[PDB]
From a paper:
The Luteoviridae are an important family of pathogenic viruses responsible for necrosis of the plant vasculature which, in turn, causes severe stunting and dwarfism, and ultimately crop loss. The structures for BYDV and PLRV each reveal a luteovirid capsid composed of 180 CP monomers. The CP monomers each contain a single canonical jellyroll fold, and are arranged with T = 3 icosahedral quasi-symmetry to give a particle with a diameter of ∼30 nm. The luteovirid capsids are formed from CP subunits with a canonical jellyroll fold comprising two opposing β sheets, each containing 4 antiparallel β strands (βB-βI).
We therefore present high-resolution structures for VLPs of BYDV and PLRV at 3.0-Å and 3.4-Å resolution, respectively. BYDV and PLRV CPs assembled into monodisperse, homogeneous particles of the anticipated diameter. When imaged in ice, both BYDV and PLRV VLPs were monodisperse, so cryo-EM datasets were collected for each (see STAR Methods). Structure refinement was carried out with icosahedral symmetry imposed, yielding density maps at a resolution of 3.0 Å for BYDV and 3.4 Å for PLRV. Density maps for each structure were of sufficient quality and resolution to allow for unambiguous building of the shell (S) domain of the CP (BYDV: residues 61–200∗; PLRV: residues 68–208). In both cases the N-terminal R (RNA-binding) domain is not resolved in the cryo-EM density, except in the “C” conformer of BYDV, where an additional six residues of the R domain (residues 55–60) are visible. No density for such metal ions is seen in either BYDV or PLRV, and no putative metal binding sites were identified using bioinformatics. As for many viruses, both capsid structures are strongly positively charged on their inner surfaces, presumably to help facilitate packaging of the polyanionic RNA genome. The outer surface charge profile is similar in both BYDV and PLRV capsid structures, with an acidic patch at the center of each asymmetric trimer. Inspection of the interfaces between individual CP protomers, and between asymmetric units, in BYDV and PLRV suggest that both viruses have a similar volume of solvent hidden surface involved in supramolecular assembly. BYDV and PLRV have comparatively short insertions at the C-D, E-F, and G-H loops, where larger insertions are found in all other viruses with known structures, resulting in a much more compact fold.
Residue numbers in the entry:
A (entry chain A), B (entry chain B), E (entry chain B), F (entry chain B): 61 to 200
C (entry chain C), D (entry chain C): 55 to 200
Write the structure that this text describes.
């Protein structure tokens, strides 16, 4: 069981995307092109996503976070979880939320974290600092 | 975790069908068009199906129940579980039978409950009173 | 399942039994009502014997259906029509008949290619109304892996 | 075999294992080395899980054959070549490896149409001489009659 | 009831065959052209087959034993029972395994014992020393 | 602090080489292209090297092991530590032997493990199964 800290950078005020955890998690090559190449099964036990807000106080908007444990949803949809663009905050997601109770093979993803900024301008918003706890088993 | 009680009504003596639990479970809109719209992950922990038998004593036949956790079987096939049309009874199904050990997303079904009455006439048989226990996860 | 063989219990059902249904339930490799024995464990053993069977009539019928379905054991595996009328389930009642080893030719092993016995049944009813179903519980013993 | 399901133990063998043999033993409905599971009891149940397996290498080889056959679990049911070389039986020695439920994806039931895991093996030997055989002892649990 | 001890000789490292017990059991003429000519009914109660392993330690392989009480199987098929070519061992088979519960006429066989060596070379493997217990009935 | 198990494979009877622990430790990408990309400082606390001996009994020779905490020695030199090619064995090396008392940066190696088989033929000898215990510091 290890802990990885990585960052989603250059996050504008109209940035939308998906952070696809697993072997397609290119923002942390220590997991993607790293330790998942040396194990069969893994599970991500909990993640702690932090918005750091490198923005001016006049930028309006709130970036939205939504968990997709189907690994297929493209557009966001839900607007309950939100970081305000002008404030640092952090959201912590446990195992049953992120499909983290059972191991799965290192070839398939576990969940996606979709985000949508929903601001008007392309001004800078900040970055995510994501701290995930993975468990591994059956070396390869 | 909450408990829903719904009914499958107007059940004739030759009625066959599938009660598709999950988002396509139209017999309980409090789950289908309801609380599953406000959560990502769910599991149905146990169901208690009851046959109520609003039938005369001269109606012959026995309605058959079969669990499909593949969510694809159309015709019934198995004839072990059965309610007699002229008698009230109840069958209780736990978690490992109904694929209820793990959470899954609110977009996909969990299991189906197929039923086939296998009587001759179109006379009234009764109704199902189904009591399901669901557990909900990450909100949406 | 040890390779020398084992003893297990199968529960299967003969379904959709009308009030004029007649037939034979041919136990062994031609016992299509339990594929776990027919297309199943008999493909993985040479010799078998069915030690005892417990046939149950479940009677999914109305009280106005007259008749009585008759049961007859054929350990020759060749009789087509019924003939004997001693053993009977009433169509409107649940009952069960249990048959031990010497009745069903179940004392000795035989190869998994040949049947052991047949269970003939004949409804003896006028209408094609529903009668019920059989729930059959057989105890098999297996010998020599294949 | 209750219609709600049961737990049984199957013993089968992977035979004629040379000193350069590689392959995959695909557990589930495609597990042709045990027809009692493949064309057998999985035809009479919806859901199953293989709780634990005990693979044994029996080493019908001379003492001059060099090499070590390698074992690797694939619970994705898609890996073709071996890759990992940690688990190994020496070709000239009898041994056994036992794999529990969380290693072989054996915690949850799944439908009898899909496989559960594969066991890949690769001899890692020069010649085509005889190495031995696997004697595999798996414990399955069954759920929902079909 | 008497006991016969006979031998299957000159057993190479790729030898396969069937030892057909009964009147066609040519490896023991005391049963084949012997006491079965003087009785109608017989049964072989138990057999004890022994592999004696007149082989060098460098011969690889294992000869396989399989009982055929149908008296028709030609190729081997099963690989559970085995003698290692470089070791002496013995397997004992009781009555229900070898179809030895009931008498049968002296004109028909009772069972076959198939063996297949499954080694590469034609080097010497050993011999079988088989000890069978027969029971005889009505004289002839 | 985590434990890595990796293997040095395809080890012939005349194989010589160096297993260079640290960022150049290509036999375990979970350390090399893995967790060392996500931390500044590391130390390998102890290693347990095991020779597994996939060899025939007629292969002569003994593979030799020598620790180089200078990370510069090319040829072997010392012949005290040895695995016999025809036997499984294991050698365990603690912290002061492998330069494992102090942290160092993830860009530089810690020690090398040189091995030289010193047999005549190119026949198969076996493999190493190496179990190392690393400690990680400041994240990166």
């Amino acid at each position: 069981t290890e802990v990885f800290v990585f960052s989603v950078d250059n996050l504008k005020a109209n940035s939308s995307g998906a952070i696809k955890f697993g072997p397609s998690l290119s923002q942390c090559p220590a997991l993607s092109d790293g330790i998942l190449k040396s194990y069969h099964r893994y599970k991500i036990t909990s993640i702690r996503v932090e918005f750091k807000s490198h923005a001016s106080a006049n930028t309006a908007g709130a970036i939205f976070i939504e968990l997709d444990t189907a690994c297929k949803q493209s557009a966001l949809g839900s607007y309950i979880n939100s970081f305000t663009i002008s404030k640092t905050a952090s959201k912590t997601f446990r195992s049953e939320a992120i499909n983290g109770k059972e191991f799965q093979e290192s070839t398939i993803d576990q969940f996606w974290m979709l985000y949508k900024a929903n601001g008007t301008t392309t001004d800078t918003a900040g970055q995510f600092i994501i701290t995930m706890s993975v468990s591994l088993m059956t070396a390869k």
